[PDB]
Ligand binder design. Structure first.
Ligand SMILES: CC(=O)N[C@@H]1[C@@H](O)[C@H](O[C@@H]2O[C@H](CO)[C@H](O)[C@H](O)[C@H]2O)[C@@H](CO)O[C@@H]1O
Lengths: 132, 135
């Protein structure tokens, strides 16, 4: 479960670039933007490609409980295929771009200034996470 | 080549807008530019003029306001090369445009004109464009 702090935190204009590869037998994976390093922290953003149920869920987790989930249109991920995801924080939400195409917009539920680290986990071969 | 390349931005741009430009600098390139213009008229104001000069080995950033060019800012060295491809990310943030060349932070240009005035992206000069995407 990859983890990495966001030194200056994240703000409108912060881009997260995740490059990786979906393992040949992957079932699903996720990227979480957490507000604390404590286990079970509020997730300002939970991005979850599910190669098995063929859907991509976006969601929040606050004070311990999940929230209203949103689903993207289709799964822009292929097993055994490499990918590149851009997560862009704008003044009003996170834009999820998957290889040259805007995929989904997620409106902020917790305040951007509460996000402190990225966590990438699940069935994924993570090559690199870069914050711009 | 696909230059000059012009892309309209009807609703303008805001903090969190990303411009990704990929292309090849050709063998005899002198220089090329990426402008964030305020109108489609010739000589329009420019919130951002990004100008890699392969012929003088400098990378210049400027703005044009009221038909008047501002004070040029120079980035740290030339991270471009004739006969070599490139990828540039111009990210609009709360206080400036972040220029990322070749996977590394290259220069930060503090805003000079209000972001709400940008209405066009133009790419031209000695460059052979692969793609310009705006996210
Ligand atoms: C159709 C539907 O409502 N499905 C939901 C599932 O999304 C949900 O699964 C969990 O979802 C969270 C994010 O919402 C995490 O991805 C977690 O890993 C999943 O187990 C389940 C459980 O809440 O409820 C329905 O099945």
């Amino acid at each position: 479960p990859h983890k990495s702090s966001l030194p200056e935190g994240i703000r409108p204009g912060t881009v997260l670039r995740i490059r990786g590869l979906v393992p040949p037998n992957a079932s699903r994976f996720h990227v979480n933007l957490l507000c604390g390093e404590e286990q079970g922290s509020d997730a300002a953003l939970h991005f979850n490609p599910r190669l098995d149920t063929s859907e991509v869920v976006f969601n929040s987790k606050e004070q311990g409980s999940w929230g209203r989930e949103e689903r993207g249109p289709g799964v822009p991920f292929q097993r055994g295929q490499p990918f590149e995801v851009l997560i862009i924080a704008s003044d009003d939400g996170f834009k999820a771009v998957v290889g040259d195409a805007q995929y989904h917009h997620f409106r902020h539920r917790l305040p951007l200034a509460r996000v402190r680290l990225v966590e990438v986990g699940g069935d994924v071969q993570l090559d690199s996470v870069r914050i711009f």
